[model samples]
Target: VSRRVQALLDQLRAQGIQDEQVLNALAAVPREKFVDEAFEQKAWDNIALPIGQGQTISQPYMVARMTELLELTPQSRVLEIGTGSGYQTAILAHLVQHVCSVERIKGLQWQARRRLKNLDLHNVSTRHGDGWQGWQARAPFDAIIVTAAPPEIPTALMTQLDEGGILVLPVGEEHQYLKRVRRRGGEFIIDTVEAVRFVPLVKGELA
Candidate 1:
């Protein structure tokens, strides 16, 4: 591991990021490769960096915290909403069985796809479609993660989660909270983790 990545992991460990799998994945993925060359220097600085298209590669802490919350296993099938910079997708791809990500912006998704390819992360699949409507063909995901905040939890996402599956995302419009929903039997159990800020999870896809 690079000294910069080790420093990043050390920072995360100090902040109470204890999941070894997540920490290892965070350490393994090249954060600098996912950002614009101009922002590469700041890639390991523990801050969200712009990735064009009014999106950002989420800070390292948030990525580790959220991924840890999913309780991912080697066999877990994850669905990621808002592929964004594809940084998080790469992280999940490293720690899980497979990742199916949906991005509404075509350019962003395509760019992210290329980044994943460059990294040789072949366990992920990308789709340019509405995030609100989750990926139906890949329904019953073991876990679902939405990188953007939605006004409210989309029922479609809830429906797509497998029994006992976990869904983690930011919800609310004026006030946002990082929430985790688990489908247990026929009921949905919800918990609020912390306050967060994210671009709104808008509907529809852009050509």
Candidate 2:
């Protein structure tokens, strides 16, 4: 494996991800490809980097933690909000049967799609839209991962979840907490995972 790959493995291992497949997937996925060349060296640093558009590629630890929380199998279907640099989408591509990602910025979505295609990640479907409103047509997802921090949980996301589906998202403004929600009948069960900071999941498209 390359030094970058080794670095990713070491980082994930330190974070308690024991699954060799997950480790290998992170190592195998070229995170540098999704980031600008200016910051390519920081790609495997287990930290978030600016990807323009007021967004940051989520840290490697949080990415793996959210993915592990989803418990994605090879057959699972995932829905990701805020595709951003598409780092998380690339990771999901390796673990799930299919992934549908929504991004509000057209340029970000376009670039991310190009990168994913270059990486041969055809299993992911990209949509340009508002993140607060879930993709209704693609409802009943097995897991939903929201990359940006919203003021609170969006009801649309919970409504789109399958009976046992899981939604992992950060809630709040400057003070935020990573939360996991499960759809159980008419009610949703929420569990706080950790404290985190993320760009706001804004309400409108850029003019």
Candidate 3:
């Protein structure tokens, strides 16, 4: 297990994730535990695997790349959209001070919650709601990572970013680009990271 995780860490470093903390977090979590029994063997393959409900446990490289873009610190408060399988949530839980993850599907959210609990990741809070809403009560997060793609960045999400905060997500339809948004004073500075694919961040919640 340790050797496989080390190989995964080496792959992440070779692919340009230089942050040692992020690399360590990536190595620490057991990706196999996050996927279904059928896909467990492929957990370390760096490919997105089905987690049912038309969603996926994001490819490892994407997760590391997105997390790297956020430039997280121990004090960072992050808002995660699309809790999918809680694999990403677990990664964030290890790096940040707190994480408020929102997922629209109740069943997915419930399962993700259980996964986090089993990992003893108490810093993450799960909510079954619309990711588009951006968890208003916990406004002004230090950083935000959206696992799914939204055709356009949500206005509420932009506003909820604390001044000097960063928001990373995939945006577009048909074609997608990983976008990194930074809030400086009252304006948002957007930078497109790279071409990528992700499930659409659908509107509304499902019971």
Candidate 4:
């Protein structure tokens, strides 16, 4: 394990990131490979870095916190709303049985796939599509995580969750905040996690 990764994990733990599985996955997945060469040196630093096309490789702490919130297991199948740098996708792929990640940008999806491939994170499947729609064919996910903030949680995403499944995302364009929603049959229980800043989750309309 890289010393810097362990150091970041220590910091994450200090910030109340409590899942051992999450911590181990954070340490195991090398963050350096997910960013551009210019930002490689700061890969292990706890800060978000631009990954091109107005997107960012989210901060290490947020990644850990959001992922830890999923409450994953070896058998959990996860759906990631934004592939972004694929750093988060790799982490989810590490801890879950599988990860079906969707991205709006075609280039980002291509690059993320290659990065995850390099890491041997083959359990993940990538799709260049609208994130709000979720992946219907792969619905009933054990957990669904949206990286970007929308005005509100989409109905499609809420419907995609399996019984007791958790969906975590940031919401609101004017004022963003983290949210967690759990599905209980036809009912949904929601919780506001914390304040956050994220790129807008854009629709699939091509101009």
In candidate 3, what are the lDDT values of residues 47-119, reduced to their tens digit?
A: 8899969789998888999999999999999999999899999999999889999999999999999999999
Residue 12, candidate 2: Cα error in Å is: 2.0
Put down candidate 4 lDDT per residue, 1-207, tens digits, no spaces: 768877888899999998988988888887888888898789899999998687899998999999988899999989999898899999998898899999988899999999899888789999998988999999899899999889988999999999999999999998999999999987999999899989888876721
C-alpha root-mean-square deviation, candidate 3: 1.0
Query: Considering every candidate listed, which one attains the maximal lDDT?
Result: 1
TM per candidate comes to 0.98, 0.95, 0.97, 0.97
The C-alpha stretches of model 2 lying farther than 4 A from their native spots are none
- List where candidate 1 sits over 4 angstroms from the true fold: 205-207
lDDT of 2 by residue, 1-207 (tens): 887778777878887987776676787788888788999778788888989676789888888888888878898888999998888999999998999999999889989999899998899999989978889898889899999889989988999999889999999996899999998988899999899988889887641
lDDT of 1 by residue, 83-201 (tens): 98899999999998899999998999999999999999999999999989999999899999999999999999999999889999999998999999999997999999999999899
TM-score of 3: 0.97
Q: Model 4 off-target regions past 4 Å?
A: none
Model 1 residue pairs with clashes: none
| Comparing 2 and 3 on TM-score, the stronger one | 3
> For candidate 4, what is the TM-score?
0.97
List pairs with backbone clashes in candidate 4: none
